[PDB]
Design a protein around this ligand. Structure first.
Ligand code: NA
Ligand code: NA
Ligand code: NA
Ligand code: NA
Ligand code: NA
Length: 157
């Protein structure tokens, strides 16, 4: 089955566990480029009662650095917030739990904003079909394909 974090039949426990950053996308491309703060390689999600604990690494000159953050439930079901390089809110518009997870995030920093979209896989890669479904979801949010970066060959340390 497939679900959205904002949908009535969402089962948050089913996103617990291993994940990998497959593709990232943004209407501010710099954020996810080589040295951007949002070029974040997911490793794990730990589902807690009213939060998610997100385990990431970043890469600078081919060296991995670990970082964790805690995303808290907001007043709206399926939305989470987290402070990281500004104030962030996010939802999971589509996941099948067992293969892929698609996130949509709004960042706000210094009075500005941008959108980030992420495609996460249980394995270090996903099928071209899923990758295409992600590109479609990006289009629905006004993010061009040229702003979509497949990171499936640089998601390892
Ligand atoms: Na810049
Ligand atoms: Na949306
Ligand atoms: Na959204
Ligand atoms: Na592969
Ligand atoms: Na569409």
């Amino acid at each position: 089955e497939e679900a959205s974090s904002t949908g009535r039949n969402f089962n948050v426990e089913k996103i617990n566990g291993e994940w990998h950053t497959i593709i990232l996308a943004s209407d501010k491309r710099e954020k996810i480029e080589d040295n951007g703060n949002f070029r974040l390689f997911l490793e794990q999600i730990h589902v807690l009662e009213k939060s998610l604990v997100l385990k990431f690494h970043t890469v600078r000159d081919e060296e991995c650095s670990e970082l964790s953050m805690v995303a808290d439930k907001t007043e709206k079901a399926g939305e989470y917030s987290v402070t990281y390089d500004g104030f962030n809110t996010f939802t999971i518009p589509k996941t099948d739990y067992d293969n892929f997870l698609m996130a949509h995030l709004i960042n706000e920093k210094d009075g500005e904003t941008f959108q980030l979209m992420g495609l996460y896989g249980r394995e270090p890669d996903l099928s071209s079909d899923i990758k295409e479904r992600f590109a479609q979801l990006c289009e629905e949010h006004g993010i061009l394909r040229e702003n979509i970066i497949d990171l499936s060959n640089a998601n390892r340390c």
